[PDB]
Every structure is written in C-alpha cells, then in structure tokens.
Amino acid sequence: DYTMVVIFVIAVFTVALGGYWSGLVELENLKAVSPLTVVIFVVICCVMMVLLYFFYKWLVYVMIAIFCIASAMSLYNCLAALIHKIPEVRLIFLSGLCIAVAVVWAVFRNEDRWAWILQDILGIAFCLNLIKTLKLPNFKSCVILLGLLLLYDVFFVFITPFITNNEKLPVVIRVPKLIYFLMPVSILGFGDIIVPGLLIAYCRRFDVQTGSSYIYYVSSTVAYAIGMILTFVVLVLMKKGQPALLYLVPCTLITASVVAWRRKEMKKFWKGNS
C-alpha cells in the first residue's frame, strides 16, 4: 500500500525539520549572546492515563479542546517563521486562519472523508513545535526519557492482551489507504515522532554547539529513518501491530552512542556542554 511510503515521509520530514529548526534557534543564542523528576513524571503521567480510562466520556472532550488550542498555537508559530523570512494585519490574518482551521477541524471531527488531512496538518504543526521548544539539557536526560517511554510501550504491548465513548483521541496521525483515494487506517501516534524527535533535535543542537558540522543530526535522522523502515518491515512480515518506539529508540540511541564514542565526544555529550 502507498501509505507506508507516505507516513514514512510525513514522519521523517517532520522530525528532520524539527531537529533542523531547533538547531537554527540555538545558532542565534550563540551568535547574539533531569534524573530525579522521572518519578514525578511517571506518577503524574500514569495518573492521566488512569483518569482517561475511568472518566473517558467527559475527559475526551477536554483532551480534544486542549489539542485544538495547542495545535492552533503551534500552527501559528510554525507558519509565522516562513512569512517572517518573506519580505500587523498579516499576523492577525494568519492568526484568524489558524483559529479557523482549528475550529473547522473541531466541528468536523467524525467526517472521516476529509478530516484526516486537517488532523495531519495540525498534528505536524504540534509535533514541529514540541520538537523545537522542549529543550532536553543533556544526553543523560535523553536516554532516561527514551528508555522510560520504551518501557511504557513495552507495557502497552504486554498488558493489552490481558484485558482482551464514540469519540477518538486526537493524539494520533490518521492516513487512509492511499490505493484508491470504507477507508481503513494507518495510525502513527505523536509519541513516535516527538520522543525521538527530541533526541534528534538534541543531536543537532549539540552539533551546533560543538563547532559547525552535520554529523550528529544526519546520523540521528538516518537511523530514525532506518528504524521506521524496520518497523514497517516487521509489520509487513509478522501480521501484528508492533509499537514503533521499540524499533526507533534503540536505532537512534545506539547510533548516537557509537558516534560519540568514535569521536572522543562522549563526556561532553553525556554531561552537556554546560
């Protein structure tokens, strides 16, 4: 099907652009001018999932509204830069366009014919903003967060078989089967684009901080693409829904570690340039 080639492009240029955009912000700061909170992150986080499981009805609409507002803000921030490069009334027009798109998507949520493109655009903007704004301070935090979320995925795949209202969470990216375009789905969540996206952004940021090159950014992006290809290959071969993190976290972490080791730049990479 011609969706494993489309969702591979949507989920790779979003990560690559987010990492490059994050490194572009860091270049201006140089020019013009956590290990203990993991327990709280685990607690609070899983509490949110428990609340979603217990109060799905009246807690899916608040999640939808939060997604609408956050995606509208992120889309405005993303589209602002492109026009800032191009040589206020225009800014308020862009804000109106973004809020109109968000409200149109919110109204047309269950129209599965053309709401998927609006959800994909809003989600791409949201991920492109979360990859840039969220600043992981050091590779220790990157490893901790990626390993924790890999363990969360493992729990996802190891608990659901034991167990086995009409709304749909907007946390996912939906693409129909692009072979005759009812339509089936090709779902890829936000946590498979953001969580390694933060690591590739950190690789680009560290590369910008240390001299001027593209080794870490290119290596992380290539390894992420290869991990996505491996995920698709495993999905095709074994007729089972395998979480993408399980194949995206090792491929990126291992290659970052190898690049750091084979460059005498591990100590700074692990501690941070600070």
Side-chain angles (χ1 to χ4, degrees), residues 20-93:
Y20 175 70
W21 189 23
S22 180
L24 194 71
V25 168
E26 189 72 30
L27 186 47
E28 321 280 6
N29 301 7
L30 275 80
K31 190 184 287 183
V33 175
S34 297
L36 196 60
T37 88
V38 65
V39 292
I40 290 167
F41 194 64
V42 165
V43 172
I44 302 319
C45 274
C46 298
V47 159
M48 201 51 189
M49 288 222 90
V50 164
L51 263 291
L52 281 193
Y53 182 79
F54 276 105
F55 292 149
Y56 200 99
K57 284 155 41 189
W58 290 113
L59 275 66
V60 83
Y61 303 122
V62 65
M63 172 76 217
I64 281 162
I66 285 296
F67 173 71
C68 292
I69 293 166
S71 178
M73 254 177 30
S74 294
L75 184 63
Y76 169 60
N77 289 337
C78 288
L79 286 172
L82 281 164
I83 321 163
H84 282 206
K85 180 64 174 67
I86 301 300
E88 197 173 2
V89 177
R90 181 180 52 70
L91 272 302
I92 191 63
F93 278 174

Side-chain angles (χ1 to χ4, degrees), residues 107-123:
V107 169
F108 300 104
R109 282 168 289 102
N110 287 325
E111 181 145 340
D112 293 334
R113 184 141 91 71
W114 58 269
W116 66 272
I117 181 62
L118 290 181
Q119 179 170 357
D120 295 350
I121 285 169
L122 261 53

Side-chain angles (χ1 to χ4, degrees), residues 133-210:
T133 64
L134 294 184
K135 303 280 282 297
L136 292 184
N138 63 7
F139 188 55
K140 163 190 317 167
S141 182
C142 295
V143 163
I144 287 165
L145 180 63
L146 261 81
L148 177 64
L149 292 168
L150 170 54
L151 258 69
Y152 168 60
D153 276 43
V154 167
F155 212 55
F156 177 80
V157 77
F158 264 60
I159 292 291
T160 48
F162 284 95
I163 296 163
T164 305
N165 289 337
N166 319 342
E167 290 271 349
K168 298 172 282 188
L169 295 174
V171 55
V172 283
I173 277 173
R174 274 201 61 221
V175 166
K177 280 187 175 178
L178 264 296
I179 193 161
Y180 58 89
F181 197 75
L182 62 153
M183 334 201 167
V185 278
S186 175
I187 288 164
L188 177 70
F190 288 158
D192 310 7
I193 298 165
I194 291 166
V195 181
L198 300 171
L199 174 50
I200 300 132
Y202 176 59
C203 289
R204 171 58 174 162
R205 203 177 306 126
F206 183 91
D207 171 350
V208 167
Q209 278 153 318
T210 307

